[PDB]
Structure formats: structure tokens, C-alpha cells
PDB file of C-alpha atoms in Angstrom:
ATOM      1  CA  UNK A   6     -23.677  -3.593 -18.831  1.00  0.00           C
ATOM      2  CA  UNK A   7     -25.717  -0.419 -17.911  1.00  0.00           C
ATOM      3  CA  UNK A   8     -23.500   2.691 -17.376  1.00  0.00           C
ATOM      4  CA  UNK A   9     -25.381   4.024 -14.287  1.00  0.00           C
ATOM      5  CA  UNK A  10     -24.748   4.325 -10.543  1.00  0.00           C
ATOM      6  CA  UNK A  11     -23.806   1.135  -8.757  1.00  0.00           C
ATOM      7  CA  UNK A  12     -24.649   1.211  -5.030  1.00  0.00           C
ATOM      8  CA  UNK A  13     -26.038  -2.479  -4.454  1.00  0.00           C
ATOM      9  CA  UNK A  14     -24.003  -5.822  -4.528  1.00  0.00           C
ATOM     10  CA  UNK A  15     -24.081  -5.229  -8.286  1.00  0.00           C
ATOM     11  CA  UNK A  16     -21.021  -2.944  -7.762  1.00  0.00           C
ATOM     12  CA  UNK A  17     -19.002  -5.782  -6.078  1.00  0.00           C
ATOM     13  CA  UNK A  18     -20.052  -8.214  -8.831  1.00  0.00           C
ATOM     14  CA  UNK A  19     -19.050  -5.748 -11.578  1.00  0.00           C
ATOM     15  CA  UNK A  20     -15.679  -5.032  -9.994  1.00  0.00           C
ATOM     16  CA  UNK A  21     -15.122  -8.746  -9.673  1.00  0.00           C
ATOM     17  CA  UNK A  22     -15.962  -9.212 -13.377  1.00  0.00           C
ATOM     18  CA  UNK A  23     -13.533  -6.554 -14.581  1.00  0.00           C
ATOM     19  CA  UNK A  24     -10.705  -7.525 -12.119  1.00  0.00           C
ATOM     20  CA  UNK A  25     -11.010 -11.233 -12.763  1.00  0.00           C
ATOM     21  CA  UNK A  26      -9.051 -12.364  -9.655  1.00  0.00           C
ATOM     22  CA  UNK A  27     -10.291 -10.112  -6.772  1.00  0.00           C
ATOM     23  CA  UNK A  28      -7.559  -7.499  -7.094  1.00  0.00           C
ATOM     24  CA  UNK A  29      -9.577  -4.997  -5.092  1.00  0.00           C
ATOM     25  CA  UNK A  30     -10.686  -4.475  -1.499  1.00  0.00           C
ATOM     26  CA  UNK A  31     -13.408  -2.830   0.711  1.00  0.00           C
ATOM     27  CA  UNK A  32     -16.866  -3.743   2.066  1.00  0.00           C
ATOM     28  CA  UNK A  33     -19.356  -1.867   4.332  1.00  0.00           C
ATOM     29  CA  UNK A  34     -17.484  -1.479   7.724  1.00  0.00           C
ATOM     30  CA  UNK A  35     -20.012  -3.097  10.307  1.00  0.00           C
TER      31      UNK A  35
ATOM     32  CA  UNK B  12     -14.488   3.901  -0.778  1.00  0.00           C
ATOM     33  CA  UNK B  13     -15.545   2.520  -4.160  1.00  0.00           C
ATOM     34  CA  UNK B  14     -19.041   1.626  -2.895  1.00  0.00           C
ATOM     35  CA  UNK B  15     -19.755   5.139  -1.682  1.00  0.00           C
ATOM     36  CA  UNK B  16     -18.277   6.801  -4.762  1.00  0.00           C
ATOM     37  CA  UNK B  17     -20.202   4.549  -7.199  1.00  0.00           C
ATOM     38  CA  UNK B  18     -23.375   4.997  -5.165  1.00  0.00           C
ATOM     39  CA  UNK B  19     -23.164   8.697  -5.910  1.00  0.00           C
ATOM     40  CA  UNK B  20     -21.558   8.564  -9.376  1.00  0.00           C
ATOM     41  CA  UNK B  21     -21.771   6.528 -12.590  1.00  0.00           C
ATOM     42  CA  UNK B  22     -19.220   3.688 -12.753  1.00  0.00           C
ATOM     43  CA  UNK B  23     -18.766   2.113 -16.113  1.00  0.00           C
ATOM     44  CA  UNK B  24     -16.328  -0.798 -16.506  1.00  0.00           C
ATOM     45  CA  UNK B  25     -13.775   1.881 -17.855  1.00  0.00           C
ATOM     46  CA  UNK B  26     -13.970   3.678 -14.528  1.00  0.00           C
ATOM     47  CA  UNK B  27     -14.063   0.479 -12.498  1.00  0.00           C
ATOM     48  CA  UNK B  28     -10.685  -0.485 -13.994  1.00  0.00           C
ATOM     49  CA  UNK B  29      -9.044   2.313 -11.981  1.00  0.00           C
ATOM     50  CA  UNK B  30      -9.837   0.426  -8.758  1.00  0.00           C
ATOM     51  CA  UNK B  31      -8.053  -2.637 -10.121  1.00  0.00           C
ATOM     52  CA  UNK B  32      -4.783  -0.613 -10.299  1.00  0.00           C
TER      53      UNK B  32
END
């Protein structure tokens, strides 16, 4: 796991990996 | 939001944990 900036879908994947069961919210509002 | 902050800053899994609070 690179410790850099995460702008792409890679950020949502990484949050999902560390949270395990989607205990987070937010997506681009459009 | 998380997306905007991690676009402009480094977000290791240690930091990402804070959004799972």
C-alpha cells in the first residue's frame, strides 16, 4: 500500500479495505 | 470530504482509519 495522495477510485477502495463493512460515507455530488 | 482532502494530501491507512470513526 503506497503512502501517497489518493484522488481516484483507489481512495474509495482503500477506505473500504480498512473499514471492512462500509462504515464511511461520501461520493462526488453530481 | 475525504476525497477532496486525500486528493490534496497523503492518506495512509493510519490516516484513513480516522474516517472510519
